[PDB]
Each structure stands twice: as structure tokens, then as C-alpha cells.
């Protein structure tokens, strides 16, 4: 979120992210660990992060149920969140 945004509004957005995984990705998402106030470095009232764990590959047959399509659908859905940048993404094969 923009600086000046409150912890409270960051939580509202995190709740929306958590909601989407728990309801729209029921079949693919095992868990969501959401953190308010911590983001890809560092702290802040206006940042947060969700770690998502998928069900096992064997229960996610099809391109549409793999991380790429999942993160793309999520980012698209999250684009309709106001005054926030929310991005779902797969970590690259290699850091640098």
C-alpha cells in the first residue's frame, strides 16, 4: 500500500487476498500464511505478504491448476483492489 496507509487498511487487503485463496482456489490451495507489516524488506504499516502452499501435484492435474495459471488468475483478480499493489508470483528458477 502507499505510505501513509494504516495497518488496518493493509489488513483489509490481506483479508481479501486470504479470502480469494480460501474460496476461489479451494481445490489447489492447501494453506495461506499471511503477514501484516512485513514485506519483501522491510517492515511497515503499509506492506504485507502471503505465503501460499498448494495441494500435491497429483491433485492439481492440468496446466490450469499449476502455479503459473494460478498466480496469473490471482493477480488478475487482485487487480481490482483499490489503492494497493497486490501481485501473486512464482519465484524464478534462480535468484539472480
Amino acid at each position: 500500500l502507499p505510505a501513509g496507509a494504516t495497518q488496518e487498511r493493509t489488513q483489509k487487503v490481506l483479508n481479501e487476498v486470504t479470502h480469494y485463496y480460501l474460496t476461489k482456489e479451494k481445490n489447489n490451495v492447501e494453506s495461506v500464511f499471511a503477514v501484516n507489516g512485513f514485506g519483501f524488506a522491510g517492515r511497515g504499516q503499509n506492506t504485507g505478504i502471503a505465503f501460499v502452499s498448494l495441494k500435491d501435484w497429483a491433485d492439481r492435474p492440468g496446466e490450469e491448476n499449476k502455479v503459473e495459471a494460478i498466480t496469473m488468475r490471482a493477480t488478475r483478480a487482485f487487480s481490482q483492489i483499490k489503492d494497493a499493489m497486490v501481485f501473486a508470483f512464482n519465484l524464478p528458477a534462480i535468484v539472480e
Binding site: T6, Q7, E8, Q45, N46
Partner: protein
Amino acid sequence: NKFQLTPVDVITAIKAQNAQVAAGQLGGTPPVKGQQLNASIIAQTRLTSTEEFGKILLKVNQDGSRVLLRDVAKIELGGENYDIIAEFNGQPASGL
């Protein structure tokens, strides 16, 4: 001497008036829920120029007369030390 001051007073005033203060925030955590405003409080910042150092207030006199740092000293940018002076073929230089 004329103003009844010493380097101690000078040093004390510079520490007090050339300062960078951690001053906190409005609406910082933990907030009163419903808070809309989060903003850094900015108090004293380091001085940036001879003029600012010049007007450091050493004291006011009984008659409201003011004694400024520039009244007891020359203020100027100058070497941290003056020990090393270089020349290149007889012309003023610096180097590494």
C-alpha cells in the same frame, strides 16, 4: 571573553542546534483502531550551510540583545585538517 563565553558553550550550542532528532510518528503502532492518519514527525535536522551555523544562538542578554555564533567566530567550509597540500608541476592540485 567579551560575551563571557567559552568553547564549552560553543560546543554545547552546536550539539543542541545542529541535531537530527528521532521524533516518532502520529498514528504509529499500536494505534487507536480507526486511525486514518499515519505520519512521521520531523523535528530538528542537521544544519546544511555556514549561514545556519552562523545564526546558532549562544545566548540572549538581559536587554534582549542576541549573541549568535557568528559574533564570536568565523564560519566557513574548510579542510577537516590542513596538513597536506599538493602541487602538480607547480600548480595547485589534489589527488589520490
